[PDB]
Amino acid sequence: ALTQERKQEIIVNYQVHETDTGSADVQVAMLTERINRLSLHLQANKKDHSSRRGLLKLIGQRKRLLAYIQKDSREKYQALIGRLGIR
Amino acid sequence: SSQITIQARLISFESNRQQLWKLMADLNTPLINELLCQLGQHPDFEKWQQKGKLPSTVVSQLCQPLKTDPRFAGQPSRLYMSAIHIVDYIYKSWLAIQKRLQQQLDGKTRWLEMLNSDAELVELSGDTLEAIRVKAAEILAIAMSLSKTLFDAYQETEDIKSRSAISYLLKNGCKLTDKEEDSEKFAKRRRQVEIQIQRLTEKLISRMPKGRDLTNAKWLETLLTATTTVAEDNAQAKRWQDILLTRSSSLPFPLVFETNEDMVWSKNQKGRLCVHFNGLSDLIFEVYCGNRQLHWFQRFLEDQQTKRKSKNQHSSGLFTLRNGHLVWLEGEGKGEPWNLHHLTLYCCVDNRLWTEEGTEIVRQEKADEITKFITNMKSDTQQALIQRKQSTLTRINNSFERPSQPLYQGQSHILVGVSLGLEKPATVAVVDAIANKVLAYRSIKQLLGDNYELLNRQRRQQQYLSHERHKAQKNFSPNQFGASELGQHIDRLLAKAIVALARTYKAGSIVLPKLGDMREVVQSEIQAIAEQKFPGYIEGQQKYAKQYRVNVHRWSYGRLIQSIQSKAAQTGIVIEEGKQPIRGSPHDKAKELALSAYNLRL
Amino acid sequence: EAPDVKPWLFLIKPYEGESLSHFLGRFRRANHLSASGLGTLAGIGAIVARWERFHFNPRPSQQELEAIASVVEVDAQRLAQMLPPAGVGMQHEPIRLCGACYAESPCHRIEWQYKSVWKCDRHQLKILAKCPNCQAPFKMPALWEDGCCHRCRMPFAEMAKLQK
RNA sequence: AGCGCCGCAAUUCAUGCUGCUUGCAGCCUCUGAAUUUUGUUAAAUGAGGGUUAGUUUGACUGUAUAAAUACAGUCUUGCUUUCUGACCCUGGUAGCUGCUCACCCUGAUGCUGCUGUCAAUAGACAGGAUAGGUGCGCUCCCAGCAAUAAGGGCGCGGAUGUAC
């Protein structure tokens, strides 16, 4: 689970502006935090198929959002994935 | 069916178990995986599928350069040989499956072409129905194997009248019929064949044998990829998911010892039977078995000692032990795998080799087969093969002095027919065939006797355990179980009851039905009905008769047939195959099954 | 009988880019047919209700388009033009609308569902994926009887000025 | 209600019984078959989870016998399963982590259903397979919930180029 402080820090860091809470860039940043933590869990917990179910959802959610961003703008898309460290 | 398996736990100190586990998991199973990969890429692979046969030596040839590859080099000679046998039998299995499926697809595709309705047969013959009926009466009078003979007659007879007459004659089960064709029952029967062709076509897209990766390196690298990389499209992400859901293989492939003397038996000073394997004699394993099997493991030592006392003038061709499989059974709980899992030896024996009379049966079977071989076989190593065969043929004459038990004698005119059904798994009729009289019926309830309550237990547990799995799946709970072992128990109880009744009436044989593939018949029948009832509504079609289709997929007619065949062979009762009639009750089906198998003796 | 009458049905002319879902909906309304009714009339059964949602596993086959081309007098080649051409990826769920096209021709265009389409080149407008006044998503094109948003009743022709 | 199972009762009957004439004719106690009712103080079934290298189901030899098997002697090991008993539980302490939920309607193979102290709210303590309904059981039915089946409705905020 994700703390409100880490959540709000993600919001502030990826916001387009101070009241943006839901742009696709903020959404993929939130999902990237979740995917990173859950990958570390599943590397240690291969039999946690319940948690693995969540990963496949989260990876798909981010895949759809990044594909949406990429055809709004490749400049914003490339900058965003570079910040998040996604190849 | 005189080959059976007996098993024992193998016990040894930890360093022996660890060394064997590492040989199996780190070298032998990776070698098997590599052989499966290379064999599936071989340029002759596509012609092996057409022959349905693997070359006798191609796995051995592929393994030779791998025996000194740093990935695989550390193994005894018999472990390489075991890996070869594993891989060779896998493809012998898989190529035989694909070959038969292809023949089924070709056979039914021809039938779909020659299945024409009388409205179509009128046009395609150019003759009135009475005219083709007469021509079918002539062609039947010549073809008098009848089915195959008509299928032979069809192909090269390009004369559309005779060709249509054969089509009409085959539509009716190789016979004349006066009655009119019900056009909707024909259209349904045509549709069944299309579904069967489609389902055969889909089954022929089987995967190549997948192997056992025990490291699961592909899973972890895919996890790192899918979490840090953008998927190029949906199909890459789907392939990632398909890998991430794939479950890890825990256990290596077992070892196979096709030379019975590669298991060397001994008794330790604490009096326990012990075994070691060729190439691993430093690892002594202690035999821990039930007394109900101990007499076999004692026999393995006595057979070994007999041939040593005779300075190898006996043949191991008559050793009661045939081969061994060395298996790790999955342990519950946690530990290092050589501690967690339990090492188990499975020995094939031929039950006839227990007695002296049965050994004489095997000796003649061996002698005839080897005398045939030596005559037909006639290089230096091929001449050495002849000399080994001639040594076997000489040495099988030396007796092991085994227990004498006179062979079963059954009356040729007394048969037991066993009717198999979805509702009543077995029903038997003892028939005196020259008298044409039933000596005894038994129902399923009389066969099970006091065990009959197990049959309601099975139905009740199959319902209950399916529903508990359904509930557990939604929670991702691992606690998913089923009644397969109870079902196996019931089929073995029935098999013993049937054979005991056969012995009691001195039946010469047990008659079993040629059911064919009941599941593909039922599945294509129900689909053809459902497509009429739910046109354009696939989920309605799949809901239709769902529980009947499930019941037919659970019907264990093969396991019951196999259990009967094994028990009859262990008492020397002949098994015969007959055709079960569709008419009548299970009792009448069993009687007419028995009597038809008697009349089919030619 | 009426003498010298040929057995007949109410027809509709398909518009130049009209989607199959929109077209079948008009044909059904012109004949007060339920979605199940047209499928029974063509004999393909429940498939029509599936096509009207753009659920195209499998795609409309040659057999079924030729079957529908028996009750609808539009030929199957023209019915295939109501669908994505081969290999053009389409999305069924987000139903989309240009509005400025709807003021010129009251049909849903199948190209508004293509994964490659986002602007109307004719109008130079970003096509809508929900009602711009009240954010309600558009219903399946078979159900566009009123030509307006089902929630706030704004006509699709007025949503033209709420684009791009 | 429906469906499955269980026994009960009844009819017919042969795989049952009776007989001399050994292939037929009676009968329905026994042992079974064909599914026909019925739920009764009946007789049968009965599914919360877990617990033994558990016992019996063996091998050989002699003797007996119509097989079936039986008796006596010697040997014996612990494997993989199916039941019947008996017993124990309703769990604990730290971590990691999925899914679900603005709100409303409908209600799914959804969830929950025992006893008795106490107890207005809240559940705790002590019992315990007697665990909602029928003879027993269900995904059915009853009662409460239902966000974690599907759908539908409809808020403000972000976003609005198809992602949400």
Ligand SMILES: [Mg+2]
């Ligand atoms: Mg989408």
Ligand SMILES: [Zn+2]
């Ligand atoms: Zn436009």
Ligand SMILES: [Zn+2]
């Ligand atoms: Zn609106």
